[PDB]
Amino acid sequence: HAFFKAMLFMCSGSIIHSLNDEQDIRKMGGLYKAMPFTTTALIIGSLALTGMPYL
Amino acid sequence: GAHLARRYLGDASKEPDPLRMPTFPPDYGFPERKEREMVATQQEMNDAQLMLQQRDYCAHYLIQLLKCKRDSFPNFLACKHEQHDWDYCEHLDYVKRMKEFERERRLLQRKKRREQREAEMA
């Protein structure tokens, strides 16, 4: 839990600072192809957080 | 499991409670029930720094996982069949665990039906 849960934060921190310190989920979207590394990092943490196999 | 449904939602009198059994004698209905065996004396299992909760009959298959793992260091993927060997006997004695659970259950049904049958017969 230490690995991915900490990870999910600065990835969200990456989104927050870049998109003018806004934390409301209502104000992002389309960051998949706009923020590739963070999007990959977020979904990796999300899959790890779900106990998805062999991770 | 269907056992809980048959107990709480069914005839709880015919369901063996885990805390209650073993109630009937070992050889009751078993001509010459054979005792379990322990290849490893408690001296080496105590020596092997093995946890008491792990200090079961199948622990005899466990005492060499740590030995080979220590010898296999740093290669952590060496012992695969050997580790598989231990969890198999884990399965075997685990398999023994619900068969005897059902054995006492079947004895419970057999005794209950017998008593009711003879009660109306007498």
Partner: protein, 127 residues
Amino acid sequence: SGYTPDEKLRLQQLRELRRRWLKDQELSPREPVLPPRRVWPMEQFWNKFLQDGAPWKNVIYKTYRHSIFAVTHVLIPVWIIHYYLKYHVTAKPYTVVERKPRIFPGDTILETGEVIPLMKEFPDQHH
């Protein structure tokens, strides 16, 4: 529904005074005028090495910084801890007491050389 002429002129005057106030909130290129400082007489070697900062120079230049940091924060601390442990902490009894070294059947104990006899034959049941 509506800057009234009085308040509109008020905001007009107050704006430009604030604009000029911020127009005085900067600093000159000379600013800050820093007083002279004394330097440790070893920076000359690195800064001269840093004059070009070539790939043949920067990695080696950073090596000294990484090396001195390694000695100061690892070598010196580990020495004093080991000296503290070896001759002061371990001098008193039962201050470094460790778990008994786990051994298994079929292993020779070092200080006695005795091989513990192999555990008796396994039932040999696999999958």
